[PDB]
Design a protein around this ligand. Structure first.
Ligand SMILES: Nc1nc2c(ncn2[C@@H]2O[C@H](COP(=O)(O)OP(=O)(O)O)[C@@H](O)[C@H]2O)c(=O)[nH]1
Ligand SMILES: [Mg+2]
Length: 168
């Protein structure tokens, strides 16, 4: 299968994005087990390739900046999530992408997710122009999302699935 990992600072919505993609709702009393994938999902890409996605989510250990080698290793895709209203979580994106790249050299596609767009724009602390510039300077892609807007979650996983489907 294809290992896809979620990274990003605490509380940005990593688990909620995963639950929306897998369950169309938040399951309130389930959390990932350390050292293993949270869930796998069979998908059919636009090109008709069938892919087994193996989705890794943290169990809260990102609060300590303590993601292990084995969490990162063998990843083919990575979603780097931040919260548009949380400036520190955006500033951390640089750290997270660097940490991924020192621990894993197999990542084919890195997608920055600017999450929580459901919140009033008066509370946003980052502009699209800054996100565009950061992703240009750091060789990654970006999308806007909200875990409460199913279309945005389908869009971000769709971009990831289509990139994974191109791997030979
Ligand atoms: N307003 C808003 N809240 C969100 C969104 N995604 C997640 N949350 C909330 O933010 C809190 C932390 O989310 P969680 O998924 O546990 O973040 P994680 O620490 O990155 O895994 C929870 O109360 C979520 O329901 C979003 O898109 N918009
Ligand atoms: Mg979480």
């Amino acid at each position: 299968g294809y290992k896809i990992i979620l990274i990003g600072s605490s509380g940005v919505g990593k688990s909620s994005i995963v639950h929306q993609f897998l369950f169309n709702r938040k399951i309130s009393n389930v959390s990932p087990t350390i050292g293993a994938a949270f869930a796998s999902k069979q998908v059919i890409a636009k090109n008709g390739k069938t892919l087994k996605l193996n989705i890794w989510d943290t169990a809260g250990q990102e609060r300590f900046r303590s993601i292990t080698k084995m969490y990162y290793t063998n990843s083919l895709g990575c979603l780097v999530v931040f919260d548009v209203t949380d400036r520190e979580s955006f500033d951390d994106v640089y750290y997270w992408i660097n940490d991924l790249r020192i621990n894993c050299h197999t990542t084919y596609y890195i997608l920055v997710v600017a999450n929580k767009i459901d919140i009033d724009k008066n509370n946003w602390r980052v502009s699209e122009n800054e996100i565009k510039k950061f992703c240009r300077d750091n060789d990654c892609d970006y999308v806007f999302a909200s875990s409460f807007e199913s279309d945005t979650v389908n869009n971000l996983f769709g971009k990831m699935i289509d990139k994974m489907s191109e791997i030979k």
